[PDB]
Amino acid sequence: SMNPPPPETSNPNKPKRQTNQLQYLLRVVLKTLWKHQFAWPFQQPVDAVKLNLPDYYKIIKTPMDMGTIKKRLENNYYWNAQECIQDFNTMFTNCYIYNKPGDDIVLMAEALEKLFLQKINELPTEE
Ligand SMILES: COc1ccc(S(=O)(=O)N2CCOCC2)cc1NC(=O)c1[nH]c(C)c2c1CCCCC2=O
């Protein structure tokens, strides 16, 4: 089976804005996770073809990854900070759905999620 197309990163029909919360999500939250030592499994969509995981997209129907989130922020895809925070949480939830306690990917996701929470708990004030 094929990979699905990656999630849309630009919608030409959506209005666009810059906010301090969106700046924080890209330049502080995403950036901090992007340069972490456990970021590499989460920097792009799971390639179930090359990795030979034919059941991944039978189990994961809302795939999400930091490469997609990064592009969404850079393309002003998100109007509300909540839309971006939901994508991060979907990415982590997918990991814990597909994988088991003691898996190396689970320990990596847990460390990244701890850091995500520390950064998102300092989300700046809304305009
Ligand atoms: C054995 O697994 C890999 C081996 C090499 C590479 S790779 O970085 O060398 N490379 C990626 C681009 O295609 C060429 C190979 C990646 C991965 N894997 C991931 O990235 C990844 N991420 C998640 C979220 C996941 C996974 C796979 C584990 C279970 C599902 C699962 O939850």
Side-chain angles (χ1 to χ4, degrees), residues 1-57 59-127:
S1 54
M2 309 154 68
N3 295 314
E8 308 178 15
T9 52
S10 168
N11 190 330
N13 209 36
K14 287 184 170 188
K16 308 167 299 284
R17 69 176 176 179
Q18 290 180 311
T19 68
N20 197 32
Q21 288 194 345
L22 290 168
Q23 172 184 290
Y24 185 87
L25 281 158
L26 174 63
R27 311 209 177 256
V28 181
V29 177
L30 184 274
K31 195 186 187 219
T32 296
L33 266 60
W34 191 264
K35 290 314 303 291
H36 192 273
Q37 73 164 338
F38 298 157
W40 62 265
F42 306 96
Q43 284 179 328
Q44 63 284 306
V46 174
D47 192 324
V49 173
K50 295 190 199 301
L51 297 171
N52 193 10
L53 303 172
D55 69 339
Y56 187 83
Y57 291 107
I59 292 162
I60 298 305
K61 300 302 189 182
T62 314
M64 189 51 55
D65 66 278
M66 293 203 296
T68 296
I69 295 165
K70 181 175 191 293
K71 284 174 190 159
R72 284 180 170 197
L73 287 158
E74 291 169 339
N75 294 337
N76 316 105
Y77 187 89
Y78 303 119
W79 181 266
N80 282 340
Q82 182 275 338
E83 302 180 78
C84 178
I85 294 168
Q86 179 173 303
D87 278 349
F88 272 106
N89 277 314
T90 295
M91 178 187 78
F92 291 124
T93 299
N94 287 344
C95 193
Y96 303 127
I97 288 171
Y98 187 80
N99 303 284
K100 323 263 171 270
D103 287 355
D104 284 349
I105 194 81
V106 165
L107 270 288
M108 298 174 81
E110 282 168 354
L112 286 177
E113 191 189 0
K114 184 153 140 223
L115 186 53
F116 169 75
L117 287 175
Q118 290 173 328
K119 292 298 159 184
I120 213 67
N121 280 336
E122 293 178 338
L123 188 67
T125 52
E126 192 185 353
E127 295 148 35

